[PDB]
Design a protein around this ligand. Sequence first.
Ligand SMILES: O=C(O)CNC(=O)C(=O)O
Ligand SMILES: [Mg+2]
Ligand code: NI
Ligand SMILES: [Zn+2]
Length: 331
Amino acid sequence: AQNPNCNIMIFHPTKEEFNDFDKYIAYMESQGAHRAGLAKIIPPKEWKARETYDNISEILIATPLQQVASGRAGVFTQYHKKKKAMTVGEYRHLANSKKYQTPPHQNFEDLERKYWKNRIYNSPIYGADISGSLFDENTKQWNLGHLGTIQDLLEKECGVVIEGVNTPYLYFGMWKTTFAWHTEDMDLYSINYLHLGEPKTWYVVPPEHGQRLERLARELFPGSSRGCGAFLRHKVALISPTVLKENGIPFNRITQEAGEFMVTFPYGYHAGFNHGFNCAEAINFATPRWIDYGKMASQCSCGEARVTFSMDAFVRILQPERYDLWKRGQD
Ligand SMILES: O=C(O)CNC(=O)C(=O)O
Ligand SMILES: [Mg+2]
Ligand code: NI
Ligand SMILES: [Zn+2]
């Protein structure tokens, strides 16, 4: 078995290998990359997402989200308070202000220490989940707006034609902006490209050990656990690396820098934070190996998790028994 310790692997494809996306994901899995739950892909040196980022300040963040924490430093939840719209130029300026800017630090490890120590005492603002793309239409390789769709994958694998569409999302981050512990909708893959700015630190649990994280979470967030059998679908809970280590939960960490791709694999729980002002683009995708994960994916029926139009068909075809109760949660 390849990569039996479930280490995060880093790949350096050549320009020739960067042509066929599906084939390169399949190659990474042949080398056991999926066991970690997360892989890094450094693009060939000849590749570019677009010519420059000089012209992005007029993108609108219609609903910036202030991420307010409750709990203790290593075990907290966050809720998102809606703020007034602002442009990417206005957001960048806010991120760089004395109130919100990254503090002086030695290195990524020092900054990671400061994050886990101090996150709860601040409420950074996140421009998350903005439909759109920063890939130039002429970028032919690893263009996240031109991938094969999850609906066409399900159709190719299972023969059923379904409604729905699959498009990317932009995330504009600042120091301490945080993504809570989660897997993707229907335990899909995700791919994330860091277009510009400061780094993003990731934590990940190997898919084979996901249930260990869930059990810990039920112990640490006992009210939430009673409220919903899949409350991590709410995407609000954080647990620090120190707390994971104290409870024997297997995990790994890695920092993504501008120009790098990250791939999360089916049922790979992940969480993390941004180091300063940045812009990432991400999208869900599928492969034939996903289908079995989609059939077994947990679902939130309590009404909190509330997701996209396109998840309907996935639940309806892959999880017909669950569909009724889940749709009651959606309405
Ligand atoms: O970048 C973020 O805030 C969150 N991204 C992801 O969870 C992902 O790409 O799967
Ligand atoms: Mg603009
Ligand atoms: Ni994710
Ligand atoms: Zn729920």
